[PDB]
């Protein structure tokens, strides 16, 4: 149910743990395309939402 680009849905992440191993090491479809973040240290540094 991926909405169209004219109107999408916002996904707000509550209090939980961010694990990005399933994104990088598991199913590496295409480029990581990190904007400003350490791909090895994605989880070692964390944000609010």
């Amino acid at each position: 149910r991926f909405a169209s680009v004219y109107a999408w849905n916002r996904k707000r992440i509550s209090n939980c743990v961010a694990d990005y191993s399933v994104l990088y090491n598991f199913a590496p479809f295409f480029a990581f395309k990190c904007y400003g973040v350490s791909p090895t240290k994605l989880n070692d540094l964390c944000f609010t939402n």
Partner: antibody
Amino acid sequence: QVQLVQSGAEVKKPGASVKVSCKASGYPFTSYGISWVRQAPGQGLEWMGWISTYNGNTNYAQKFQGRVTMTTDTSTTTGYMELRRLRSDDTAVYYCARDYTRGAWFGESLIGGFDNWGQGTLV
Amino acid sequence: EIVLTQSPGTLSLSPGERATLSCRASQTVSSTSLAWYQQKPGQAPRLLIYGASSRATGIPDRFSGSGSGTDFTLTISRLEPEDFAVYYCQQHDTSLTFGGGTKVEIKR
């Protein structure tokens, strides 16, 4: 690694409520909901139960809408049914499963299937 | 709801040969609305394919998927004699419906 354990066989008279439990372990009990299916010999399965873990969103089947009520507990990560409106010839097996089709937080249309099943109980 | 038109009534063929499982939809389903499962006598169902053709539980050389658009098909090559598993196919667009069931006998 994942362990789904369940109680033994039970027989419940008609008109009562059968309590069925399934303890889940071995997987993080926050990223997946708890689904519940029924099976009888000579036929496939159904879509009778689903309750999430983060929230209590209800997505039961319309065929038995308002007939199934159940709880999920994070203390032991156990699913409990207090199934009512019991019938004599509903001695069909009930299976707990990990929902990888319904979103456990928002309710997305997750591509995939119920990759895991419990050991089963007899009612 | 939308049910899947299934007619693998009885795949009474010798193990190790080509096996075809039909899961034609009713009118129209998305290509990524598929799920194939196996069940054995005296054994709980196990998942086989969670998507179009990706492997979910092992699948060394037997289970494969083909099709395009709406129609899709399951293919088995070099079937292991012991399994004789009853196959189920489930969609994703309209709620969740299972297959009727495919019975396979000994074929001595």
